[PDB]
Ligand binder design. Structure first.
Ligand SMILES: CC(=O)SCCNC(=O)CCNC(=O)[C@H](O)C(C)(C)COP(=O)(O)OP(=O)(O)OC[C@H]1O[C@@H](n2cnc3c(N)ncnc32)[C@H](O)[C@@H]1OP(=O)(O)O
Length: 145
């Protein structure tokens, strides 16, 4: 897998295909993409963008750490899963975040992906909550200090 920087606009197709296929494309244009210091990473394989991840500074009231970042739009295309594409994006992001002096990376994880974040060393906090139309979620975080 080759990890490369990508632009916000480059994430919309895979966000739409994988995460929000039953919603208008506008639902994939996350307002958080326009928050200060937002960045995006792409995983490329065989000449195709096959994994995406987006990060921006956001301090969660129920997590402790002076500087925190949120992960949004984590997705790998069917056919290209189980190749460490997603893990490679998260590890590369952790280097960028550690260099920026971030203390923590968090995500409102789909529960169906909780085991992925667990394998990457994330812990769960709090309770499962539902967010229609995209289902049960759980706050997960990884301290990177
Ligand atoms: C709010 C959010 O952004 S959370 C949304 C997460 N995305 C989704 O749910 C969309 C659909 N799923 C996906 O896109 C992918 O399955 C992802 C992003 C969760 C994982 O991407 P991949 O590129 O396949 O991950 P990668 O290959 O790095 O997997 C790392 C490890 O986690 C495991 N893993 C991957 N997905 C899952 C899962 N859904 N549940 C449990 N374990 C998982 C892999 O088996 C691997 O384990 P191993 O090292 O023991 O073999």
């Amino acid at each position: 897998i080759e990890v490369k920087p990508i632009n916000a606009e480059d994430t919309y197709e895979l966000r739409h295909r994988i995460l929000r296929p039953n919603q208008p494309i506008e639902a994939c244009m996350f307002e958080s993409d326009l928050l200060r210091g937002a960045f995006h990473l792409g995983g490329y394989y065989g000449g195709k963008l096959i994994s995406i991840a987006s990060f921006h500074q956001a301090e969660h009231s129920e997590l402790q750490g002076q500087k925190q970042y949120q992960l949004r739009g984590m997705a790998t295309l069917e056919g290209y899963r189980e190749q460490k594409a997603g893990s490679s994006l998260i590890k590369h992001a952790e280097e960028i975040l550690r260099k920026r002096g971030a203390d923590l990376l968090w995500c409102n994880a789909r529960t169906s992906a909780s085991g992925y974040y667990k394998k990457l060393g994330f812990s769960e906090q709090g309770e499962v909550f539902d967010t229609p139309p995209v289902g049960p979620h759980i706050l997960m975080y990884k301290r990177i200090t």
